[PDB]
Design a binder for this molecule. Structure first.
Ligand SMILES: O=P(O)(O)Oc1ccc(Cc2ccc(OP(=O)(O)O)cc2)cc1
Ligand SMILES: [Mg+2]
Length: 297
């Protein structure tokens, strides 16, 4: 049971060892397509690639590769597409993926610039009057409105398939204060953000998989997805004790390598799930408390 176990691990100071054991048992599948010479420029990081079995294929006969993986959680009945922050040359592919997979929301857990370095391209419009056209994939993207809060911003975007003139509203959830290889300010800030995404319907089964990304699409992204899935699992059963956090992470790791990058992010996942369990188990008022504690204004 996660809380009891959280106590034992904490008291022993064994987060490093527990996290290392997870890395040790994690799946290892080939990424042949990711490593093809022609795809060199489609990967942000040499050491972070999508397994061939779970990679998202772009619908085109030219080059269908994009550094993105489909994390299909069978038991939880939820899927996510984890991807790297798009590069200057892969922005069109990114939106093509969003279009083809029928995603309703895009969760960004990083900033364009971190530690003096460009960790992701500016793939969405920053101003209403300056829309973006991706010539290669024939898509148009316009900023419709944005709600800026202290540590996150929600944007309403309009994605248009110029070939068919069909349009869709895409919701962009941008967490701007989560340091790479770091953790959110508090479980409250994280849960407040997660519940905003949930609240929007973006994580609902009637839509394609929500797209979740960070710079590499594995650390902060893995943390986000792990907490959400564990919460959904205990929600289905209304039984927090049926959830084995580590087992869940290993299951996700069958779909994309390196999910959750540090022992502290793992520890933070436990905290988020234990705190979130309060809402799942009947205390709906806790949601407004996270909102207050997050100081989003
Ligand atoms: O670049 P460094 O900071 O020097 O060390 C890293 C090396 C590789 C990664 C990605 C990565 C890490 C682990 C991984 O899977 P696993 O070995 O835990 O199974 C898959 C990708 C992240 C950090
Ligand atoms: Mg203006």
């Amino acid at each position: 049971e996660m809380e009891k176990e959280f106590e034992q691990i904490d008291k022993s100071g064994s987060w490093a060892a527990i996290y290392q054991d997870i890395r040790h048992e994690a799946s290892d599948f080939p990424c042949r397509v990711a490593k093809l010479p022609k795809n060199k420029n489609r990967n942000r990081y040499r050491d972070v690639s999508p397994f061939d079995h779970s990679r998202i294929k772009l619908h085109q006969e030219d080059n269908d590769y994009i550094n993105a993986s489909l994390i299909k959680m069978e038991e939880a009945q939820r899927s996510y597409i984890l991807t790297q922050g798009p590069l200057p040359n892969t922005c069109g592919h990114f939106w093509e993926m969003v279009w083809e997979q029928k995603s309703r929301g895009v969760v960004m857990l990083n900033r364009v610039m971190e530690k003096g370095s460009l960790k992701c391209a500016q793939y969405w419009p920053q101003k209403e009057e300056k829309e973006m056209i991706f010539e290669d994939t024939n898509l148009k993207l316009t900023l419709i409105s944005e709600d800026i809060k202290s540590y996150y911003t929600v944007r309403q975007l309009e994605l248009e398939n110029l070939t068919t003139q069909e349009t869709r509203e895409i919701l962009h959830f941008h967490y701007t204060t989560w340091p790479d290889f770091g953790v959110p300010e508090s479980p409250a800030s994280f849960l407040n953000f997660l519940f905003k995404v949930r609240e929007s319907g973006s994580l609902s089964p009637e839509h394609g998989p929500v797209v979740v990304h960070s710079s590499a699409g594995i650390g902060r992204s893995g943390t986000f997805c792990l907490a959400d899935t564990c919460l959904l699992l205990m929600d289905k059963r209304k039984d927090p004790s049926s959830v084995d956090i580590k087992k869940v992470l290993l299951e996700m790791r069958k779909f994309r390598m390196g999910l959750i990058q540090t022992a502290d992010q793992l520890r933070f996942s436990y905290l988020a799930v234990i705190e979130g369990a309060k809402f799942i188990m009947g205390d709906s008022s806790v949601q407004d408390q996270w909102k207050e504690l997050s100081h989003e204004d």
